[PDB]
Amino acid sequence: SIYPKFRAAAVQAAPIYLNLEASVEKSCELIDEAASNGAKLVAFPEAFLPGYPWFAFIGHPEYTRKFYHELYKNAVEIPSLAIQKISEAAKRNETYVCISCSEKDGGSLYLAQLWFNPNGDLIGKHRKMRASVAERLIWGDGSGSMMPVFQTEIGNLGGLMCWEHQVPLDLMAMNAQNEQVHVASWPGYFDDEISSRYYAIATQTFVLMTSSIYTEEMKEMICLTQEQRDYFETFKSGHTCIYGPDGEPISDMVPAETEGIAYAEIDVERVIDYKYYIDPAGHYSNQSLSMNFNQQPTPVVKHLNHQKNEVFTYEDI
Amino acid sequence: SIYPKFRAAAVQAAPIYLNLEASVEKSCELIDEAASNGAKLVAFPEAFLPGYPWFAFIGHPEYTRKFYHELYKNAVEIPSLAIQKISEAAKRNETYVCISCSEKDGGSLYLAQLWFNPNGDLIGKHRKMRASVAERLIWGDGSGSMMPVFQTEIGNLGGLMCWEHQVPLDLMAMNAQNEQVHVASWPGYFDDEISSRYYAIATQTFVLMTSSIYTEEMKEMICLTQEQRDYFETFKSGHTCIYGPDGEPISDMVPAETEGIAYAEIDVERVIDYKYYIDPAGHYSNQSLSMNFNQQPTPVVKHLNHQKNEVFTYEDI
Amino acid sequence: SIYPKFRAAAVQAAPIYLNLEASVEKSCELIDEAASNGAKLVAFPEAFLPGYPWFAFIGHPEYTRKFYHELYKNAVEIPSLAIQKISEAAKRNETYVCISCSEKDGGSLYLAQLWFNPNGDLIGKHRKMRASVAERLIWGDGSGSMMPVFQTEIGNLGGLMCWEHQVPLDLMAMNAQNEQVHVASWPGYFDDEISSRYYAIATQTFVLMTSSIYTEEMKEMICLTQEQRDYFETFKSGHTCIYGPDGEPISDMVPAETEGIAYAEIDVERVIDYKYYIDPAGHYSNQSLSMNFNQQPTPVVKHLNHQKNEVFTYEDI
Amino acid sequence: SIYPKFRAAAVQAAPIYLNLEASVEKSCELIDEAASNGAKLVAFPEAFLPGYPWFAFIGHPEYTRKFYHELYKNAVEIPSLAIQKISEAAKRNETYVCISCSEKDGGSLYLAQLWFNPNGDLIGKHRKMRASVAERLIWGDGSGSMMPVFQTEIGNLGGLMCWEHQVPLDLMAMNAQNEQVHVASWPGYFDDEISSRYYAIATQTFVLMTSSIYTEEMKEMICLTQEQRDYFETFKSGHTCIYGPDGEPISDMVPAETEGIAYAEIDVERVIDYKYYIDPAGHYSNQSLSMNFNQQPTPVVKHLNHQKNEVFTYEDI
Amino acid sequence: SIYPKFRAAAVQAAPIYLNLEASVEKSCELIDEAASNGAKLVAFPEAFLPGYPWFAFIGHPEYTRKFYHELYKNAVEIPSLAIQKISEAAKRNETYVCISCSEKDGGSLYLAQLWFNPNGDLIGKHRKMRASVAERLIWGDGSGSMMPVFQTEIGNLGGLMCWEHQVPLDLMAMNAQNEQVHVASWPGYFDDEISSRYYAIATQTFVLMTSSIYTEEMKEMICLTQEQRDYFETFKSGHTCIYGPDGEPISDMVPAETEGIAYAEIDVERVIDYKYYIDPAGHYSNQSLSMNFNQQPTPVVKHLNHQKNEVFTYEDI
Amino acid sequence: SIYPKFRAAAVQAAPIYLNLEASVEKSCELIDEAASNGAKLVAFPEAFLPGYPWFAFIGHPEYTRKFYHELYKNAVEIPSLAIQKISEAAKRNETYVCISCSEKDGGSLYLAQLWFNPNGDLIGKHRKMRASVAERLIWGDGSGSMMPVFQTEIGNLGGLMCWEHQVPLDLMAMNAQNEQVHVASWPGYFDDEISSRYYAIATQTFVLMTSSIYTEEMKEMICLTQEQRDYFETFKSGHTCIYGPDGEPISDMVPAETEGIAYAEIDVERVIDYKYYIDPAGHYSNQSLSMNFNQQPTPVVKHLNHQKNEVFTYEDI
DSSP states (O other): OOOOEEEEEEEEOOOOTTOHHHHHHHHHHHHHHHHHTTOSEEEOOTTOBSOOOGGGTTSOTTTHHHHHHHHTTSOBOTTSHHHHHHHHHHHTTTOEEEEEEEEEETTEEEEEEEEEOTTSOEEEEEEOSSOOTTTTTTSOOOOTTOOOOBOOTTSOEEOOBGGGGGOHHHHHHHHHTTOOEEEEEEOSSSOOHHHHHHHHHHHTOEEEEEEOOOOHHHHHHHOOSHHHHHHHTTSOOOOOEEEOTTSSBSSOOOOSSSOEEEEEEEEGGGGHHHHTTOOTTTTSOOTTOOOOOOOOOOOSSEEESOOOOOOOOTTTO | OOOOEEEEEEEEOOOOTTOHHHHHHHHHHHHHHHGGGTOSEEEOOTTOBSOOOGGGGSSOTTHHHHHHHHHGGGOBOTTSHHHHHHHHHHHTTTOEEEEEEEEEETTEEEEEEEEEOTTSSEEEEEEOSSOOTTGGGTSOOOOTTOOOOBOOTTOSEEEEEGGGGGOHHHHHHHHTTTOOEEEEEEOSSSOOHHHHHHHHHHHTOEEEEEEOOOOHHHHHHHOOSHHHHHHGGGOOOOOOEEEOTTSSBSSOOOOTTSOEEEEEEEEGGGGGGGTTTOOTTTTTOOTTOOOEEEOOOOOSEEEESOOOOOOBOTTTO | OOOOEEEEEEEEOOOOTTOHHHHHHHHHHHHHHHGGGTOSEEEOOTTOBSOOOGGGGSSOTTTTHHHHHHHTTSOOOSSSHHHHHHHHHHHHTTOEEEEEEEEEETTEEEEEEEEEOTTSOEEEEEEOSSOOSSGGGTSOOOOTTOOOOEEETTEEEEEEEGGGGGOHHHHHHHHTTOOSEEEEEEOSSSOOHHHHHHHHHHHTOEEEEEEOOOOSHHHHTTOOSHHHHHHHTTOOOOOOEEEOTTSSBSSOOOOTTSOEEEEEEEEGGGGHHHHTTOOTTTTSOOTTEEEEEEOOOOOSEEEESOOOOOOOOTTTO | OOOOEEEEEEEOOOOOTTOHHHHHHHHHHHHHHHHHTTOSEEEOOTTOBSOOOGGGGSSOHHHHHHHHHHHHTTOBOTTSHHHHHHHHHHHHTTOEEEEEEOBEETTEEOOEEEEEOTTSSEEEEEEOSSOOTTGGGTOOOOOTTSOOOEESSSSEEEEEEGGGGGSHHHHHHHHTTTOOEEEEEEOSTTOOSHHHHHHHHHHTOEEEEEEOOOOTTSHHHHOOSHHHHHHHTTOOOOOOEEEOTTSSBOSOOOOTTSOOEEEEEEEGGGGHHHHTTOOTTTTSOOTTEEEEEOOOOOOSSOOOSOOOOOOOOTTTO | OOOOEEEEEEEEOOOOTTOHHHHHHHHHHHHHHHHHTTOSEEEOOTTOBSOOOGGGGSSOHHHHHHHHHHHGGGOBOTTOHHHHHHHHHHHTTTOEEEEEEEEEETTEEEEEEEEEOTTSOEEEEEEOSSOOTTGGGTSOOOOTTOOOOBOOTTSOEEOOBGGGGGOHHHHHHHHTTOOOEEEEEOOSSSOOSHHHHHHHHHHTOEEEEEOOOOOHHHHHHHOOSHHHHHHTTSOOOOOOEEEOTTSOBOSOOOOTTSOEEEEEEEEGGGGHHHHTTOOTTTTSOOSSEEOOBOOOOOOSEEEOSOOOOOOOOTTTO | OOOOEEEEEEEEOOOOTTOHHHHHHHHHHHHHHHGGGTOSEEEOOTTOBSOOOGGGSSSOHHHHHHHHHHHGGGSOOSSSHHHHHHHHHHHHTTOEEEEEEEEEETTEEEEEEEEEOTTSOEEEEEEOSSOOTTGGGTSOOOOTTOOOOBOOTTOOEEEEEGGGGGOHHHHHHHHTTOOOEEEEEEOSSSOOHHHHHHHHHHHOOEEEEEEOOOOSHHHHHHOOSHHHHHHHTTOOOOOOEEEOTTSSBSSOOOOSSSSEEEEEEEEGGGGHHHHTTOOTTTTSOOTTBOEEEEOOOOOSSOOOSOOOOOOOOTTTO
């Protein structure tokens, strides 16, 4: 393997709430801005296309149904027009890109992270392993066969998201792949400094805290009664910064409410210092403990030897 | 996909019994009248060309032979005049039509459904997977690579008949491919209500339940003896009607004893907000269960590289 | 398709042994007589032109070499006078004809059947798929792209010879083409009755069982010594008769000692109510067994873009 | 191989109708006597325990359904008393035994052959590959992974039932495995010698042609009305014989009206004398035709790593 | 490639006629003695186990069938003891061995070579393609899949048999695989000098030419009557030689009537002097003529995934 | 299609080296004498007009250029006086004649055989597929669409040259067209016995082996150093003879290295005896080997619709 040095960027921003066709073009302006400064990797916050479902836990389970109907008509798909306009934006700048989506498959709905190469092609995708209490009635279940780490020109990339950082089995699974740089996206409400800072120590990587900001149109959309409106103002706002494998910040901190970007030098050769003290998947282990990591895909129904069909054209008959 | 809104119709009728050349013309006089109301989809009851074989139910395995000898001469081959006239009847009205028949291949009969689109040509066909108690003497076996569901401007659609609704894995095999509008066809003796009501709930789908009626043309031929002509009056009659994805009627009910049609508005966007409660092939699954859906053609002999012979015509020799 | 009614005839006869120019006139006067009764179809025994090679059964592999030198001069070699003399006879009356012969192309002999239509043209030919035990060293090999059945005014027609009825694959290979009236021919000797009779039950078709008889000139030049003569006189005699799809004779049998003709009046629609019990190539089958039928013609050397040479001439030079 | 020599016997009999306990005890009388005359192998007719369903060939579904109720409670099952009672006789007398019976599994009936070996134990089973004309109401369908041949002591053993002799690919799938002594079990009506004598020639084996007779007990429980009684006495009755690979019978024809036994010497070395002429899967073939034979086990639902549960005792609680 | 150097030996011998256990024991002491003198490769005449069928062209088809009955029992099968007795004699001496024999396979019978390697294992086998004039009664035909050439510690090895050297397509197919050292088994009757001198030049390879001799013990059994006793004195006897790549004999002719061995020294890089003039598959070629080679196993039935069996024991039952 | 018999002749001689004007006169007195003895076919050795280029085999590429300047002036340039003098000689007598020469097209030389017929006309032409090791730098290159096999009153005729007998698939290219009498032309120096002997056995024609002799006059104009001459004397002597389908001579060989002729009876009916043993392009073949014989005339530039042009004569000007 090889140990590169490069500049990386992390973005604090918000979408045009529940509208996809504005939000994809806002991302194109914001990535051409980010890449203009020569950063080689760019990463966006949680659920950026089209937006995180705050309505799922301001109201009772019946209040959600009328908003879910408007989310479901604005989710993305693998061959969708929303992918072409990102794939061209990567191709025109020659940077690695990491973006978060809600995907529609087989009439069901999921949360995913999605990656693009400097040649413009889609490297792969990741699916949320389990939903937290706000999410469990909006989004579908995970899979164990969709937990990649990629060999690249810029070292071994990966990235969990959200509450996944509280589960030690996923820390071990990701560390078994020998990751080196790791994106971590948060919606904004959950308390996120302490768990992302522990993760940097536990697997010896750089990490990019990335998170979203609240805006005026989303509250005018989602509140209706006064005790929903003045209750929504209870939520804490997020922040974004990047950490070394020692657990201190290397970047500055983006101001705690405004839209903006942070960036720093990354010098991945420096990781070797900290692998001397500890390595959970190597020498710092015990023969009395193990882990079973199944990696085959098991869709609920499996097509074998998919084939097309024939038609008798009207000229024939 | 596009979530269209349109008017649909279902017809309750009887064929001119065991005569193909008369029965196809009666079907034309029905569809050319059903199209006047502007309905974009039309569906017919079970085995409509030439007719369902009641003689299998009321005599021993030798008695059915003398009638089978008259059925076989009236079954439909694919390039027959009987398909050219239906293709004209679709093309001249620009409506989707689903029609049912005895289809004859090589030496054997099968039961099939045929789908024609507004351009007048076939989209495809489907074959009965297994026969019920009586007709298993008459019709041949099914195939598993012969159950398509079609993408089209009116949203994804397909269909089934008779006891197919009693088989749980087959119900899953439609849901696996995201069907949205469904034709369910019945010969009228079996109790057609409760299983079609359940299929609408289990897949959240609009169901066009469609059924035949008896007539004097049966009575003067099917039963020779007095005890047969007595016994044949035992049978129940059908209930042609349209159910919503809530499991309740949207149309009126056609009266239980006469020829006629039913129709309603169909608003396909309304399927979305019932997916929130239950989705058997999506988020409601578990890793401990799965399905092996193999779909590749397998006739008993498979021709390879079809070729044509040469003729030494009389002028050369 | 349509079901005909007609009279068919089967001819029991012997050729003028190893003499083609005599034997073709004998074949003509048999058709000229047999057509007087109004029979639409006529069939002949195996290797009627010029004769069957009995010498292979009564001597070691050097003994045959002196007679093979004469057989090779008397092969039919299409096109020739041996074809024109039959093609005229089939047009002088109005019947189908099936005749079997030794055919020469390139350097090798083969055994073949030739089929003539009432317009006097060849419909096609068939080559024996494998030799028996004794003629294994006289005639060449078969091909898989030369097993046609012909679609005609008198239904679907085809035919086989000799031991082909002992091989279960070939029953399937003909049944999948859907035959209705069938020709089978034998040289006598092999005990033909039960092997022929079974084919009628297995494929539900009328079988025109046909065979040849021994003569004085057939033995007087072939028996060079008394230990060959008193051996050859032991051989079993043949039969000629018509069997129905019930496995019973409809005609009489021609007397075992002499030349003669058998005929019956046949009604092709009568197969339908036997097809009710079993159809091995249709509904009477299992997914666990299948046949590969490679219909691709592959001669040893395949000419591509055949051209005609052009020459200088004595006037030009 | 070894090419052994022995004596074998075919049994002609009738069961005590729809009674299991009487019919299993009747077999222990009949095996012990048949083995006392020196026979090493014995065989039995179609569905001998509890009895063949003649009530399917008369009346209509409402007539047969009330008799099915008493058949279902009398069917055998894999670990039952009925098998224990037979296994005594196969141990004591030092013989092979072949017996055919209607076994059940899950909710469902089948028809199967049971083979026992002189050590005392079950060597394998065979399950009918398709129902016959009236049987299609009663029994479930077979599978391709239950068609063995057994290599032991008296050549290679195998067998088939009813119209399996009419389907060309079953002959083929058997000859590919080199069987040498064959059992062929028939019911009463539609028993034929022709489909048996052809099989003997087509595979070159000895054949134990075996069938059952009607009995006085049947009438006043099979037919409840005068028409059904006067119809049912019209059926033909079966034969029993041993055939050599010559196509000639090697034992006397046992009478058409008695609880008889036919037995003869068998000399397996005599078969190789005729294997010289033809072999449909050996030297008598070409590359244009071949068969795809798939024998994976295919239950509808297959258990994986099934285990046995824990429990709490009333002493513990 | 590597171009090794070694001493090689060609064997002239006769088997104990039609006795396998006598003939295989002679082959052990002959392999041992030949290997005692420093030879690294040893090759045997055509059909040395159990012996060549000279009775095939000394009488008519009834005379030979009673001898096939005694040949068939003395054939070699794939896991037999004759292979075990040879395999140990290869491992005892560290020499490559080529031998040829009647391979019994299922019901069928074939003529094949066997190639053994100094570790003791099989390298592979080769089957005769299409049998010679009298032989095509006895053995079955080969298949195009079994046409190997072996990359080996003594350079690339292979070998045709008998009249296969008369067919130009087999010369092309073998020369396309870049073979270096070759063996040519003959039965000792046909003209085998010109048939092999040309092959050495056409391939540019050393060839071992080997043949068998008669012995009076066979004449006392294959010909009872006086005529064949006289006729079977008139046949030729074969040569044994080694030829260089220029078609020149490199070692002494073995006497025409005695058992014994020829030795020579093989020097594989001597061949490079001759590829300079001609290479029929490399530089000595044209675009307009080319050959199609189909390499794929062709069994008449192809077994898919196999399965084992369960027997309920006499202690379970 | 007929089997003639006739007397045939072959001649060994030499041209007047590199002089065309005398060498055509030498060919005329040889035909006018050879035909006086009553032979009906006459054949000539390699490159007879104006002579084979021995000056290519000795000395370097800059030396051979000096003599090519003379060879190019003496090519046959069809049509020309050089062929008109042969056409007269072949019409004065009544014999087929086959003559070898260096042809010229546009800028390049080629090697050809010309065939003349008893009406005096040129029936066609053959051209060498590829050059020998030395002559590759003198002559041009072959094509696939110039493989004639002429039908004639003396049977099917054709003929190859030099190493063409050592390209195995080229024998198949002639045998595909059923050749019967064959002429084989050699320059001397090469070993012509075993390659022509094998061709006679392999494709069963008669063979006219024909070759040239050295004159002293050629070496005294070619050699200028001593060691060129001393090297030239190492070359092998010539031969001429007629071989039968048995692979043995029917004529004497021409007794010495001196100008002279050989002749024999040819009885074409006698080939049929040997096609009983083997026929490589017919029954002695397999399904896994084929050939692609593409005979399409594709010169480097292909004229389309050749036409002339107008001249403005001095009257119009």
